[model samples]
Target chain A: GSVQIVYKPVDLSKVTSKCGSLGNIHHKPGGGQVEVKSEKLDFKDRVQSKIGSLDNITHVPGGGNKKIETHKLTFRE
Target chain B: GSVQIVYKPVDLSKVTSKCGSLGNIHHKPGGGQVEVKSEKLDFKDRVQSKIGSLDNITHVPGGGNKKIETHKLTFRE
Candidate 1:
């Protein structure tokens, strides 16, 4: 089984360097991609740490709430 | 490694029935938990489908972006 997330990221402004583990990131606005980081062990914890390492983020849109992107989490097995 | 996301969901009114696959959803205003679903394979695709099966979603927040929650996705190996 694998975990997947379909949502906007911290930066969707023409990004480079694949912002995820093992180069498993898809870059685009309202786009898609894969992020597999079994090496770390706990993808969930990494999320918290990621946020902790940065400032607070939310539907703020980065763009703002009006255009805030949807954040969907799902599992496939 | 695993994938992790710390954000609000479609519904955060607080009820029952584990959302995601299996039993890996942490219920709370700003909570946490685990969700592993390798059975189907593409956790990413499933995420898009989940949203497709329904309506459009965004940081819009069922709670509304005003209080829109943070949607953080991470991978751990």
Candidate 2:
């Protein structure tokens, strides 16, 4: 049997996206999406590398003309 | 090939919704959803008018017992 946990519609603003590009999509103020890299046999190192690369994204809201990169990761479902 | 990027698991609770009744589903405090009106043939002005008509929403979270309008926008996968 599968259990479905319905949260109390917590503000989407509170959801935080983890994993450089291979984790889950977290919700943040002003909103942001996260992506994770996982290509076949590269799963192991890719995950580690992705985590390491997460440092660059300090400020969620890009100041001016600097467009942020929002990547879409591969998901089975 | 398309490149992929990943982000850290940022905490939510601070997301804010934008685009009334059409575009993206922005996360807001208390998990608020935005609706954007896009009905085909009217693609051009529709996007514009949608942006204009978006001013009516006040105080992301309602005060009294008033009902909130939550519309489902069509998205192509």
Candidate 3:
């Protein structure tokens, strides 16, 4: 099974190498509102090999499902 | 594969049910010092049916190895 998400242009790809700790990551969406939702959370590259860019998301964590929405995701170790 | 660590009394066990979102967790490490290294991290329970615990940690992430030591592990969603 794979994470499901629909990005603009409907074309997408996963990143291979480590994206490294990111401090600047956000999306405008169709709303055109600048949002740095994923920026707050650290350990950006993880979950086997590494996760994809904040490119677009609708991630559903295995062992469980999570939905994140807030002002900051306070980075992690 | 399973994670390896040593705790006092030389007795240990893995929790089957999730410990749930934790805001209070730390260890003295027989050093008489109180530390909450994992507390800052959010999503306290996960990774294929949850993990051990802040009970005692020397976690080495798979897909790679990780050593975390810091002040606050800013929680995630």
Candidate 4:
């Protein structure tokens, strides 16, 4: 089955902890997240938790030179 | 297990519901969707329906002042 892939790097610069100023803050945008590409699209039951991320956000000395994590989600028809 | 995340906010402004006619669309693009980051990537059976979204588009009067929602998905290896 053909599928559509959506890649979104959340703009973490706009995020606040609500409890405190964003900490560690190595990655200027911080970590990344993933989501389905459709509001009405559904995948098979066997395809559960198809998400991925890096172990940790690497800290760049001066800041804003961190790697951006790419998360992938799949839908099979 | 290391993983990757993919987030895609479908450009609702690009969508004509026509099955078409874009409406509400407060989020500007309307809503979000998830897809595998790879056109050739495949996920295991356990990764099914692993998508999420915010309840509804908040109606902010006067236009162009709104908080975008972040949807996340996880891929395990």
lDDT of 3 at A41: 27
Candidate 4 per-residue lDDT, tens place, A1-77, comes to 33345475444343111121213322233334444332233444465443432222232111112222333455422
TM-score of each: 0.15, 0.13, 0.16, 0.16
Kindly report which residue stretches of model 2 are placed more than 4 angstroms away from their true locations once superposed. A1-77, B1-28, B36-38, B43-47, B51-77
Span of 10 residues, lowest total lDDT, candidate 3 chain B: B8-17
Question: Could you list the iRMS of every candidate?
Answer: 25.2, 25.6, 26.7, 23.9
**Location of the lowest summed lDDT over 10 successive residues in candidate 4 chain A:** A14-23
Candidate numbers, best lDDT first, in rank order: 4, 1, 2, 3
Candidate 2 has an lDDT of 0.25
Give the TM-score, chain B only, in order for the candidates: 0.16, 0.15, 0.15, 0.19
RMSD of 4: 23.9
Residues B1-77 of candidate 3: C-alpha lDDT, one tens digit per residue: 22222221211222111222222222223312222222333333232222222222332121231122122224322
Off by over 4 Å in 1: A1-8, A12-65, B1-77
lDDT of 2 by residue, B1-77 (tens): 33322333332433222322221233343422333332232222113211211111212211112112222222222
On DockQ, the candidate that comes out on top is 4
DockQ of each: 0.04, 0.04, 0.03, 0.06
TM-score of 2: 0.13
